Symmetry: C5
Subunit: 235 residues, 5 copies
């Protein structure tokens, strides 16, 4: 009776594909109902989800056919979608306040180091140790920016209550949620190893929570700020 | 001559895929004609149907190829779409009245227990008995909320005639319509068993009625309330 | 040289798929240019065509692979799209006048008896004779409604010239156009029999005319009424 | 290493598919920026291109698999898309002037005779000679209409400079551009014959020019007229 | 461990497909937020990305199946997408200033010579030398136009700060970014030769940067000019 991990692997790939195409359409359709200052935020949110959905459509095909789906495949999605998620901190701030363009590049370059540093270590192009180290340095920058950098100070000075809640929530996703992936990398590569079937499940589930909760956090910020403005217009 | 159950299984998978993509596009296109307070209701309705349509597209492929479509596959759709349907009670109330956000989480957690409780019992991760029990407890919460809870009291105090009709109708779907699935689980798992082909037909037909009637109930509420408002504007 | 019927079967399946996806997009894109009272009419028109297009996409796959496409497959499309076409008489009337909701259910139930009555006779679940009889009773109701029923009286009392033209045109499609299908059923089932290849061609061609002419009749009504109103606004 | 015609055949099928899906989206997205009188013109333009794109998607599949793509397959696209292109002369005139609806039917029937006349001769259902003759008679009508008929006189009396340019340009496409297809038919059927690999290239390239140049001619007319009106509003 | 080039080839085809469908949807959805004078610029930007995404969808299929993806396949995409990118210089200028239509044709013909000149040399229809020479002449025209031609003079006289930034940025892409492709051609054909696997990677990466950076440059111009206008309206 007990379903085999292999069964759960290709099931979760379907789940992820459906959930993310759903979230995508939902965020792209509700982009017309947020104040216009939030339109790019909502367009980037829906397109992030669409990109990830297309990844899972590709991967489910590779699983159905070949029966294998390596973990290095992820760095295609991540190179795209981690980048877009870290940029969301800038896009959200520009919605409500004025921030230097430099924040955009610090954040993006920080994401690119995290993913590329780990890819090089996973693909074999360099020691997985040096892969981990470069990846963690990339992360700790991003965290450094959003906790004690221009992004954090810009948040405080915005005065936007929506942007306060967004930041507090996205920062928590990027700190706890995103800590699964490094862990995975460590155990799989620098450690004993994990069956790829089992690591495909964990990554599939973590993606469900680190992409949906991210999306809903940002969507509530856009919807709450939109309403706040309408309520102040009424007064 | 007599078509074989196997024939009717893969036919109904097509029916369900066509009907649900049709209902999806219809609810997403008519979302621009309802009062704006009903836009999220209509966006969630169309995206629920799209998610289910994508499921049936996946499953029809598995059937066409392998010739088998297990009943545990359903919990991918259900984990997504049951959740969204139970949340519709909150989304509808927030359209017309003021309701605690806590209701959102009581309802969602209630759905997650129902589906996950049954998945664990169907996958083999726990006795199907304990699966049933946990599933039914999850349901009876949801029913408890919408019959004698904050959702029910908020409905009464809304004063919205549309929200009255919606509730009365959705409550009936969730009580009678949704009682097929537990029944299935009982007979298939805790009972003698069903032949999977037969249970795929029943579930395919029940999905047609528990997703279309749900959608049309909610669509009529949004369309009726929209008009009510226009008629009071004219006065 | 002479193309074989088998060649024309899979060709016509492509034709139908293209024509119906084309008509679908055209009716869904032109729904924004008709008076808003015609928006549901145009949304149902485009979604009817989309549902049929998806059917033909499925069937062309079955043909390309298996080389066979049974005639009982049609009742998937028909159960959906015949229902929607018979309801169009109600949706059009509610665009321009006030009609009882009962008409909706008389019409829908009439369609469901027609298709289901014939499915049961085609699938083998009952004598094809009793299938025919139940199917024809279902049709003759629908005709009875639209010729000498509430639908007919509501048309006369609407005073809408567009709704007069629509009715006259749709009632002619439902009387002459739709008489091919019963004929087919009779000859194939109650009669000697028809090669499925030949009957797939006839049904493919009849669908092209009974779905396009239907769509264009309804689209002209919506476009003509829209303009009539603008011309009276100018005066 | 000179690429083989077979290589160029399936390459050009891809080209055509991409170009036509691109033109389709472009015309359907720019339909919102033309004066509303041009909305049906632009909706028919985009849907013509979409229909042809879907054809080429089907055909590329047949090529990739079977390695053969007969030239009689074209008459599926042509029956749809030639009809729509000849009707564009009516749709454009009704945008800017008042024209009898009879022109619509003369033009459509003229197209249907051209394609069907040639199909019957290509499929084998009648002498290719009689196929050619019936096809050319159908064409020469259409040319007769647009050069010396109601379409030509309506153009002159419109006074629309955009409709003058469109007509002059579409007339040239229908006279020179469309003369490739008859030629092909003659050489392939009434003449010696052409390898279907070579005739698929010529037809693929001619479709690229007789569908893109057609589209851009019509799009410039809609965009030029839109602006002309805005410039006269400013004065 | 070290991933094989073959692995990276089909991975990058996925990346490119996802990134370009993402950029496409993003540019087509943000088309509604730029000043209307920028709507064609944004529609051409999104459709360029879509055309390239569809190419990579085709090519990934050819790789997955056949295991080979020749470098001559590229000229299908390039004939379309290079053309559209060189025309963007005209479309952008017409957004903000008055420019002769002749520039459109000089630019387009210049692109067509570049790609076709190289195709003829790659396909074998003429010496790769003469292919290179004709290709480089085509390029050097385009550069000549945009550096010291009507396009450059029109830019200077526009007075638009957005169009200044766009031009300077696109000119840099067309000069440095686009210099990789000629290099490839030279080394592969006129030179020693390169494994197609390696050249597929380089071209895949260069496309990611020469199509995204192009798109973001143009999008910033449209977004910056839109805002500049709003800011001057406020004053
Ligand atoms: C939607 C997918 C997401 C958010 C994935 C997140 C990925 C990371 C945070 C990866 C981090 C890594 C390190 C910090 C160490 C080196 C290995 C990585 C790339 C897995
Ligand atoms: C659109 C699909 C729907 C609404 C499915 C509904 C599913 C349920 C109501 C499932 C309920 C179950 C129990 C109450 C007991 C345990 C077994 C379940 C999960 C089938
Ligand atoms: C778009 C497809 C259409 C309109 C199909 C129409 C189908 C019918 C009118 C079927 C009628 C039948 C009878 C009246 C008796 C025998 C059984 C049927 C279902 C073929
Ligand atoms: C987009 C495709 C187009 C415009 C195809 C055009 C087709 C024709 C003009 C066909 C004409 C023919 C004749 C005039 C003679 C008989 C053979 C035909 C059908 C090829
Ligand atoms: C999005 C794809 C792009 C921008 C591709 C650019 C292609 C070129 C600039 C090709 C140029 C060539 C030459 C200048 C010499 C001959 C060979 C070519 C076609 C590769
Ligand atoms: C409650 C959500 C559970 C999602 C996990 C995956 C469930 C699907 C299991 C599919 C097994 C199919 C067996 C194929 C052989
Ligand atoms: C000034 C107002 C805010 C505008 C922000 C624009 C954000 C657009 C989306 C950014 C996408 C980032 C790149 C993601 C892909 C990975 C990196 C590719 C380039 C090297
Ligand atoms: C100011 C920041 C503009 C960012 C534009 C998007 C960049 C995408 C990646 C390169
Ligand atoms: C043997 C494994 C050693 C892993 C060391 C990782 C150190 C991370 C430092 C990041 C800054
Ligand atoms: C409280 C209302 C907003 C809920 C957003 C989260 C949606 C569920 C995913 C967790
Ligand atoms: C007023 C104009 C209304 C335009 C509405 C268009 C959006 C509704 C349709 C979205 C359908 C998305 C389907 C995506 C399928 C992905 C698989
Ligand atoms: C006030 C409006 C809040 C709108 C929320 C709409 C989206 C709710 C989605 C909840 C369920 C998604 C599936 C979660 C699975 C765990
Ligand atoms: C029974 C679970 C209730 C969880 C939600 C608690 C209140 C959250 C308000 C935000
Ligand atoms: C909690 C409601 C369900 C109780 C019965 C569980 C199934 C018992 C099977 C013996
Ligand atoms: C003008 C009438 C168009 C109907 C086309 C009928 C189908 C033609 C397809 C033939 C396929 C040939 C395969 C051998
Ligand atoms: C401003 C007007 C914009 C109208 C755009 C929406 C028109 C309807 C498009 C529906 C497309 C559905 C395509 C099929 C999706 C599932 C397969
Ligand atoms: C003013 C009263 C309401 C007028 C508009 C009603 C709109 C109904 C549009 C949807 C009709 C769907 C009915 C056909 C469903 C097809 C499948 C039925 C299978 C049982
Ligand atoms: C008169 C309003 C009727 C609304 C019906 C909505 C569509 C029902 C679909 C089948 C049940
Ligand atoms: C709505 C339901 C329509 C059912 C039509 C078929 C009835 C068949 C009765 C057979 C009795 C032997
Ligand atoms: C009247 C609605 C019937 C819906 C189910 C139809 C199933 C048709 C299956 C045919 C299979 C052929 C092999
Ligand atoms: C009207 C009733 C339908 C016709 C039935 C005629 C008898 C059928 C068997 C030949
Ligand atoms: C505009 C598209 C140009 C395509 C040229 C294709 C040439 C193929 C020659 C084959 C012999
Ligand atoms: C199996 C090898 C396939 C190579 C096909 C190359 C086809 C390219 C056709 C290009 C037409 C446009 C050139 C400019
Ligand atoms: C406010 C402007 C919104 C414009 C939206 C236009 C969307 C319609 C154009 C895309 C239609 C594509 C249909 C593809 C169907 C494939 C099957
Ligand atoms: C004021 C009147 C304006 C009328 C506009 C009519 C628009 C018609 C658009 C659709 C034309 C379809 C032409 C036929 C398509 C192919 C079907 C014929 C048999 C192959
Ligand atoms: C006056 C013409 C109105 C449009 C009719 C559309 C006809 C489509 C094919 C029959
Ligand atoms: C509408 C297509 C016209 C076809 C006419 C066919 C005439 C054939 C006459 C001799 C056999
Ligand atoms: C209507 C004009 C017909 C021209 C072709 C005549 C037949 C040529 C056969 C040799
Ligand atoms: C860091 C950005 C990603 C670069 C491309 C990644 C390609 C990984 C593909 C691996 C496929 C393994 C098959 C065995
Ligand atoms: C063979 C290559 C085919 C594609 C090349 C052409 C693609 C771009 C054409 C569409 C955009 C033209 C828009 C013109 C806008 C300005 C018109 C001048 C008056 C303002
Ligand atoms: C200024 C005139 C622009 C016309 C664009 C036509 C494009 C034709 C396809 C290359
Ligand atoms: C200046 C145009 C480019 C000339 C290329 C010369 C190539 C010489 C043979 C390698």
């Amino acid at each position: 009776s007990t379903l085999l991990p292999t069964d759960i692997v290709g099931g979760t790939f379907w789940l992820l594909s459906m959930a993310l195409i759903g979230a995508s359409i939902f965020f792209l359709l509700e982009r017309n109902r947020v104040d216009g200052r939030w339109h790019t935020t909502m367009t980037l949110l829906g397109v992030t989800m669409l990109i990830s959905a297309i990844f899972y459509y590709y991967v489910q095909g590779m699983w159905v056919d070949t029966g294998k789906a390596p973990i290095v495949l992820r760095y295609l999605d991540w190179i795209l979608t981690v980048s877009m998620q870290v940029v969301m901190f800038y896009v959200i701030l520009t919605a409500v306040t004025k921030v230097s363009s430099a924040l955009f590049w610090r954040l993006l370059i920080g994401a690119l180091v995290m993913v590329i540093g780990g890819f090089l270590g996973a693909a074999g192009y360099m020691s997985a140790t040096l892969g981990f180290i470069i990846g963690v340095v990339g992360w700790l920058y991003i965290l450094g920016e959003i906790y004690m950098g221009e992004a954090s100070r810009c948040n405080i000075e915005s005065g936007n209550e929506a942007t306060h809640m967004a930041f507090n929530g996205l920062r928590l996703i990027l700190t706890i949620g995103w800590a699964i992936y490094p862990l995975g990398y460590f155990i799989n590569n620098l450690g004993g190893g994990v069956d790829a079937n089992s690591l495909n499940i964990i990554y599939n589930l973590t993606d469900f929570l680190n992409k949906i909760i991210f999306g809903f956090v940002v969507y509530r910020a856009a919807m709450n700020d939109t309403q706040a403005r309408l309520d102040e217009i009424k007064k």
